Write a protein that binds this ligand. Structure first.
Ligand SMILES: C[C@@H](OP(=O)(O)O)[C@H](NC(=O)CCCCCCS)C(=O)O
Ligand SMILES: C[C@@H](OP(=O)(O)O)[C@H](NC(=O)CCCCCCS)C(=O)O
Ligand SMILES: C[C@H](O)CO[C@@H](C)CO[C@@H](C)CO
Ligand SMILES: O=S(=O)(O)CCS
Ligand SMILES: [Cl-]
Ligand SMILES: [Cl-]
Ligand SMILES: [Cl-]
Ligand SMILES: [Cl-]
Ligand SMILES: [Cl-]
Ligand SMILES: [K+]
Ligand SMILES: [Mn+2]
Lengths: 466, 265, 593, 466
């Protein structure tokens, strides 16, 4: 049945965007902007013409410091290449070539669009960026929806680029493997187009932790780069990707659907201004001041009430609305990271806030924290694997598909996005290092960079359906 | 109906190949085998024994309505539901009247309803049992079976590339054949099992007779596929089999680069 | 204008490798069969039968029993041939003691090996070759040093790097540094595990403790050192080898994880970083993901593997781990000129043995044979050797040029392939003893294809064109003999007549970056090692120091490796003599045995 | 540009279905029936209620002979369970339960539909089959298109079944893992829902050989079972799945697009009646009679011509239209399997026909065979791996994603489907053994069982757009 309860959607300045929105209208199964976000991730790729050109020219194909060497000075090496030195050494050039791909980016873009297009009106887009070094590609829904997979933009663009370059420059047979390598990298020896020059926001389709995890296999650094560090937009993008992922995992179903929808609305979309209000109340303080603000707001809104007073005077609280209590804890969790990691302007403590905001909440109330164990559990695992020898890394390399951080049902990665947004440059593996091209290219897509208002406007368009 | 040319046949060796594979050319019968000996050699069923079945008779299995299947009449073994049985032969590298890929081409041109594998050391033919028996009359009794160079052997098949024994016989680890009074005789069946009486295949051909009828090129006798003055020489100066080989390579390479590149070539 | 065949007369010792199998002229088409006593003609199989009787009595289950061979015919109704390692009489360098054996006397032959001596299952040199590949972890250290300098606030110097490496050599195998009451590993079990580094900056190299240095200037001739150092630049790369015993409990994917742990600890301990400081996670991430070179990439689900399985190793990485390219034999063996053929025929030896016996057999299929005779044929008795040099001689005379200098046209490839195919067939046809030695059609077919590709690759410098010549041998072989190889041999040969210069999605890819996961190559013996050799020789012939990855080439230039990557045919022969001591055995912690 | 050349589409009875169809109109990127076929594979699953009920009742959960034992006769075992036998043994029942799922199938179907449906009239369907033992489920496009993955029908159905069973029978906490196991099997210890009771025609999304291979990871036995052994419909289903897959692989692009489209039309859709005509001409003969018929038809239609006559009289032929020549070889290849394996009514020789039809074609003409090497190459690999110790299996277990048979660009698996359709029961791993439920349940979908007429009708509807 429809999630008819009304919420207000507030922007990151704490002012209302849209009022009286049924919860149903922000869900991934309904909201056109949320669904377009998934569609753009599926259908968009970047072609690195500068990278392909450099690989062909120098022989530095693929990754890992690979180099296919061409030796132009063979007669200067001190070697004899003929028995007894009968004939002096002659150099050859057999692994490399100079093609003017960047100079020709505009014509290449036109040829690429024609190869990708199915019908003239189909919405295929190819845009020249970075002075010809990069093409942004969005394939049509017509092409993308031909079969069942999300990789069609990646695979068609790589083949179209390879074919059109072979044709445009009328290259000889020797060039076939090399031009293929320039776009595909080590494919098919690798499943990935490893070290290639066609890039998707999505990971390779071999890499899921389980069915439905593709929209979760997106690093927090990618999200922060694409939203250019605007904290609550990073939160909204991460939370919405998690929300889509949890639909695809099968967990936004039945007696869990409302719970899952409220995580997204309250933590990710600043529903009822809770996140903003909590940061405003507690921002001059510590994590614990956010704990106080969260419990106070839950009481003010009738979500919890005193259940029992023990002889010491300690009070157990009861959840009058368990799913909404959970969602308020999730909202308080992102507010707590904003206050704590925001005060330091340093992301690393996000893992500690994730654990101890939840631990303090339980000790304060006698009610279960976010995810009934997952919030503290991932506080533990994420803290460990961001401060130890065993694995992991800095906060921004985690994702909803990372083994360390996958468990929480949609409310953990957004706080990582918040913390990394607020970081002043304390990391080596920050968004600039791992996600620079992603942020520069895909961050130009307005829906990716600024999802909050798009989701709210789309919800308002459909609100009277429910 | 189009008239097949089969393969380039510019010399004795390749004309011998064409004769083997062309189903309009009768293969001459050169020996007679009793029904008892014939079935004993195959080793799947003996004279008078009922055929085993792998499935019920075809008319009883409820084939679906299917207009395409209608166009293809089943073999007698298929109608009966016979099990699919395998026979294996090996041709020496030393001037055999048939060799391994020519077997595949011949089988696919002369016999209906086949499975067949080519290996360096043996060739399988797998058919419904009664159909296999009919095919084996050609394999065992005609000019494509020289008793000393084309032998029946279901396993432990090494010998195609071994040196010939002192009588000119191809090696058999299991010794299913022996030369006896100038005749080749199977003293064991194709499976290496005992036979009540040896199966006389008659006399083998001499080396010059084998060479007249052989399908293989061999450098030592002066008939390599590629002669000393052939590498890189113009097509008109090399054997037609090499002209053909060059063409296939050029067209596979260019066509798999861009198909249109081979238009008109 | 062709010399006497190497398989009838080795160049220096004058051994007749084919005649030695039989005591009869190999030109004679006559042999007696069923006169050898079955397996009694084999020392190894006879010894095995006696051992099997003891094993049956001890364990209560029968095992090896040659009398089970079908229909009363023991194996050995024909000669069970012995083998001579190709080319050992033409070596003159590499006489140093190694971790696995005292110095070989260069030029000494290894003849009379039985097939079972060259079975991967029975040959620890072959197993150790693979183990040395897969236990290797390679990393740039620049990001770890950057994290220390900026996030933690401590200067990195040659002195701190030396302490780091001393600590990493303590903990990579055996010890602990930071903690009380911590278990440790018996040093005897892990004496093959250590860590080194290399750099293109000669001043830095000289400032480091030389015990921890792979010295590019010492290991390589000057032109090759120059090329490798130009690529490495002013950077430091770590090369760590985890214990052989450890990968034998698990997989090569352990290596980057293990070094991630131990290198992280060595950073904490050399730089006095608090236990639990956030910087720690940058170290492990750098080692596992951020600045890492793997021998192999991951494989998809049907053949699922983490990094550093044989199936993930690109052909050109197999080419470049081989170290024959820096030997005197490869640098001056053609009357003072470079010898790319020596590079090809050595590099294809681990190429074939590891991909076919180590991987296709010991991961994807298996059993007691190791498919050993199939592959022994490519590095014994000078057969492939003669055919490959034949093509080089032919081409140098025809085009009046040196190695690497024949124009890389399709027509020139086809001409050389036609001649090498012709020569291969002439010899198999004219020597019945050779035809019987290489009794499987696959051996004979792969050998003419490999020799053709070797000649084209060595003579043009073009690795894709050299490998194109391999596939062109399909009609040249089939239309002559009317047989090829085993049932499934020519999948890749047929299709790569078309795929070599295709650019379709999973068809096009340069040979350097193909490997056992290129779908055409994923199943069948007798091919990949040949391509590996051809890639290595093509690069050598055009004046390069490596084919694919200079970091890999430098990382295997290391005399502390258990296997001698410079002379693999020799090493496999030494294992055949039972004279190769591998790493990874558990003698220190097991009863007297 | 559009593939405007006109073909006629013929049915398997050799009569025209639709005339004057532009090749463009049968391609997966355009044809609505082809696209709906992919969509139905993506959105349909089956729920085995009988299997789930049995697992819960007996403790035979999942696969591999797993059994969680409940012991109802503990006092009869000859054991003491108390020191000194102080207390007599008492049996417990802790791993199993009896739920009347099959008897309640109609109500279960209603509850499942309500959980899966997103909006009224969205196309969600649940059908009770096999007298309650199986549900056929088709999720809405609305639900299926929410994110990027094809697994949403599988994941949502498994969770919805688990939730609704827990609710309907008001089960206690102990039941949660067990009911989950009844539907999901070993998930998430396995990525697959291994041994569970929610079944998709598609494989688990971890299992691709490369990006775009999902529509290729479908065994020939599944195709034959779903088409109920009607030879050319099995060919059409296989060929169309391969055609979709090759779009998703990126290989139906640029200078390869026409070649790839013609493989589908000529081999898969009996274009211009070539397949039917070749079988009719040669059906009383051997593989070689199909070789003769194929070369004759190529000559009749002007696809090839004599290029050169050698001194022996042997004639090299040239391809006037290389891509059409390739497609005619592909049509001849399926006709050859039909004649050869049809005569034997035994599938095993399909691998030999694949190899030798192509080898005979080359020797007959001097032109390259199907796929420039792949047809013979896969003839070799498939023959080997269906008759040797090393791996593989009988013909019906292969697919376009199997390592042995993947290489050919779309023209190999359909001939396997033909051969297995014609087999009289000579296998032990036939469609009945591997694919019985698939054939019984998904074979009821008309588009899956009988795609030829649907594809032709859909092509005629759009023909005037090109
Ligand atoms: C976290 C993850 O490592 P990465 O972050 O991906 O490098 C994972 N390792 C582990 O889980 C290490 C587990 C053992 C060490 C901790 C023992 S408490 C793995 O290899 O995939
Ligand atoms: C075919 C396939 O096996 P399956 O058919 O999946 O059982 C595959 N094995 C192989 O490729 C075996 C290769 C080695 C044996 C043949 C050597 S020529 C594999 O394990 O995935
Ligand atoms: C198949 C044909 O004989 C191939 O011709 C080549 C020998 C020459 O053609 C090339 C040089 C130009 O297409
Ligand atoms: O006989 S087969 O070619 O299948 C296997 C050879 S090892
Ligand atoms: Cl990728
Ligand atoms: Cl609720
Ligand atoms: Cl009878
Ligand atoms: Cl599954
Ligand atoms: Cl075309
Ligand atoms: K040193
Ligand atoms: Mn010992």
């Amino acid at each position: 049945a429809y999630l008819t309860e009304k919420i207000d959607l507030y922007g990151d300045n704490g002012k209302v965007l849209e009022s009286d929105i049924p919860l149903e209208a922000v869900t991934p199964v309904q909201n056109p902007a949320v669904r377009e976000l998934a569609s753009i991730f599926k259908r968009s790729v970047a072609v690195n013409l500068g990278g392909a050109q450099k690989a062909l020219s120098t022989g530095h194909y693929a990754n890992e410091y690979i180099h296919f060497p061409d030796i132009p000075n063979k007669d200067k090496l001190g070697i004899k290449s003929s028995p007894g030195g009968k004939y002096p050494p002659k150099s050859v050039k057999v692994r490399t070539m100079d093609l003017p791909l960047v100079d020709d980016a505009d014509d290449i873009a036109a040829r690429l669009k024609e190869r990708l297009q199915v019908n003239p009106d189909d919405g295929t887009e190819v845009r020249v960026m970075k002075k010809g070094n990069v093409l942004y590609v969005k394939i049509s829904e017509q092409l993308a929806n031909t079969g069942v997979e999300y990789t069609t933009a990646l695979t068609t663009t790589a083949q179209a680029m390879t074919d059109l370059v072979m044709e445009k420059y009328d290259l000889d047979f020797h060039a076939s493997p090399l031009v293929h390598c320039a776009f595909y990298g080590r494919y098919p020896q690798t499943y990935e187009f490893m070290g290639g020059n066609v890039i998707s926001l999505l990971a390779a389709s071999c890499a899921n932790e389980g069915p439905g995890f593709a929209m979760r296999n997106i690093m927090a650094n990618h999200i922060v780069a694409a939203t250019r560090k605007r904290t609550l937009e990073a939160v909204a993008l991460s939370s919405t990707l998690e929300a889509i992922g949890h639909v695809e995992m099968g967990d936004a179903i039945g007696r869990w659907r409302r719970w899952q929808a409220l995580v997204h609305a309250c933590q990710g979309l600043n529903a009822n201004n809770v996140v903003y209000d909590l940061v405003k109340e507690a921002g001059h303080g510590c994590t614990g001041d956010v704990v106080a603000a969260t419990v106070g707001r839950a009481l003010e809104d009738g979500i919890i009430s005193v259940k029992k007073t023990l002889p010491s005077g300690y009070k157990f609280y009861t959840a009058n609305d368990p799913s909404m209590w959970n969602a308020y804890v999730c909202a308080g969790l992102v507010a707590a990271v904003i206050v704590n990691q925001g005060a330091a302007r340093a992301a690393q403590g996000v893992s500690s806030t994730l654990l101890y905001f939840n631990d303090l909440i339980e000790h304060e109330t006698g009610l279960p924290h976010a995810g009934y164990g997952d919030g503290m559990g991932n506080g533990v695992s994420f803290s460990f694997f961001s401060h130890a020898i065993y694995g992991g890394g800095s906060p921004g390399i985690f994702s909803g598909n990372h083994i360390v951080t996958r468990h929480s049902k949609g409310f953990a990665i957004p706080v990582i996005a918040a913390a990394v947004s607020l970081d002043s440059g304390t990391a080596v593996y920050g968004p600039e290092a791992t996600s620079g091209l992603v942020g520069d290219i895909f961050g130009e897509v307005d829906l990716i960079r600024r999802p909050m208002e798009a989701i709210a406007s789309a919800a308002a368009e459909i609100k009277d359906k429910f | 109906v189009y008239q097949r040319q089969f393969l380039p046949a510019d010399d004795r060796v390749t004309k011998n190949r064409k004769k083997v594979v062309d189903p309009s050319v009768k293969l001459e019968k050169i020996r007679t085998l009793s029904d008892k000996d014939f079935l004993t050699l195959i080793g799947h069923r003996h004279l008078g024994e009922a055929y085993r079945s792998v499935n019920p008779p075809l008319a009883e299995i409820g084939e679906p309505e299917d207009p395409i299947r209608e166009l293809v009449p089943p073999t007698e073994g298929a109608k009966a539901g016979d099990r699919v049985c395998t026979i294996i032969m090996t041709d020496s590298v030393y001037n055999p009247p048939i060799a391994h890929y020519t077997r595949a081409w011949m089988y696919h041109n002369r016999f209906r309803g086949i499975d067949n594998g080519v290996y360096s050391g043996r060739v399988t033919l797998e058919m419904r049992e009664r159909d296999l028996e009919e095919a084996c009359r050609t394999l065992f009794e005609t000019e494509i079976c020289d008793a000393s160079r084309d032998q029946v052997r279901q396993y432990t098949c090494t010998g195609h590339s071994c040196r010939l024994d002192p009588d000119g016989m191809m090696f058999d680890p299991i010794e299913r054949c022996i030369m006896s009074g100038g005749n080749v005789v199977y003293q064991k069946d194709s499976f290496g099992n005992p036979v009540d009486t040896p199966i006389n295949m008659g006399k083998p051909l001499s080396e010059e007779e084998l060479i007249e009828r052989t399908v293989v090129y061999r450098t030592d006798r002066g008939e390599p596929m590629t002669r000393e003055g052939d590498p890189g020489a113009p097509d008109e100066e090399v054997r037609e089999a090499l002209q053909w080989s060059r063409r296939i390579q050029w067209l596979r390479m260019l066509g798999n680069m861009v198909p249109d590149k081979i238009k008109g070539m | 204008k062709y010399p006497k065949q190497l398989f009838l007369e080795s160049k220096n010792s004058k051994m007749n490798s084919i005649e030695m199998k039989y005591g009869q002229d190999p030109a004679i088409n006559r042999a007696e069969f069923h006169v050898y006593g079955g397996v009694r003609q084999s020392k190894r199989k006879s010894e095995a039968w006696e051992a099997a009787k003891r094993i049956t009595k001890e364990r209560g289950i029968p095992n090896y029993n040659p009398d089970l061979h079908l229909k009363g015919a023991q194996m050995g109704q024909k000669v069970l041939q012995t083998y001579r390692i190709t080319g050992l009489d033409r070596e003159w360098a590499g006489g140093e003691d190694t971790p696995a054996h005292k110095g070989w006397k260069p030029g000494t032959d290894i003849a009379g090996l039985e097939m079972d001596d060259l079975n991967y299952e029975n040959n620890p040199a072959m197993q150790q070759c693979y183990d040395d590949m897969r236990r290797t972890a390679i990393n740039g250290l620049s990001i770890a040093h950057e994290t220390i300098e900026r996030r933690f606030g401590k200067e990195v110097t040659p002195e701190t790097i030396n302490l780091y490496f001393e600590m990493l050599n303590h903990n990579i195998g055996a010890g602990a540094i930071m903690m009380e009451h911590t278990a440790e590993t018996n040093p005897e079990l892990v004496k093959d595990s250590y860590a080194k580094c290399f750099t293109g900056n000669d001043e830095l190299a000289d400032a480091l403790d030389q015990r921890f240095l792979i010295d590019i200037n010492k290991m390589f001739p000057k032109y090759q050192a120059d090329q490798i150092k130009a690529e490495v630049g002013d950077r430091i790369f770590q090369v760590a080898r985890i214990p052989t015993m450890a990968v034998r409990t698990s997989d090569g994917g352990l290596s980057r994880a293990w070094v991630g742990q131990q290198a992280s600890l060595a950073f904490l301990c050399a730089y006095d970083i608090p236990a639990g400081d956030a910087v720690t996670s940058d170290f492990v991430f750098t080692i596992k993901h951020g600045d890492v070179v793997f021998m192999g990439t991951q494989l998809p689900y049907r053949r699922a593997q983490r990094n550093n399985s044989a199936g993930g190793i690109a052909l050109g990485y197999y080419s470049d781990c081989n170290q024959t390219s820096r030997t005197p034999e490869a640098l001056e063996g053609l009357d003072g000129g470079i010898d790319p053929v020596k590079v090809i025929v050595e590099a294809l030896t681990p190429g074939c043995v590891i991909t076919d016996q180590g991987w296709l057999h010991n991961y994807l299929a298996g059993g007691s044979s190791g498919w050993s005779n199939y592959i022994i044929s490519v590095y014994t008795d000078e057969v492939l050797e003669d055919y490959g040099y034949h093509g080089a001689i032919y081409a140098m005379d025809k085009w009046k040029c040196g190695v690497g200098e024949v124009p890389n046209t399709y027509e020139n490839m086809m001409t050389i392939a036609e001649e090498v195919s012709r020569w291969s067939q002439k010899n198999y046809d004219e020597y019945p003893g050779l035809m019987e030695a290489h009794f499987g059609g696959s051996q004979r077919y792969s050998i003419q294809a490999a020799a053709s590709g070797a000649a084209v690759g060595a003579m043009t410098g073009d690795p894709d064109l050299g490998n194109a010549a391999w596939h062109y041998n399909t009609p040249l072989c089939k239309e002559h003999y009317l047989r090829l190889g085993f049932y499934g041999h020519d999948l890749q040969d047929q299709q790569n007549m078309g795929h070599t210069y295709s650019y379709r999605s999973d068809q096009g890819i340069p040979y350097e970056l193909k490997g056992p996961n290129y779908p055409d190559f994923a199943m069948n013996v007798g091919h990949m090692g040949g391509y590996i050799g051809i890639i290595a020789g093509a690069a050598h012939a055009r004046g390069a120091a490596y084919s694919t990855n200079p970091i890999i080439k430098a990382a295997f230039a290391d005399p502390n490796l258990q296997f001698d990557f410079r002379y693999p045919r020799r090493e496999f022969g030494i294992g055949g003599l039972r004279q190769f001591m591998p790493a990874g055995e558990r003698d220190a912690v097991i009863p007297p045995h």
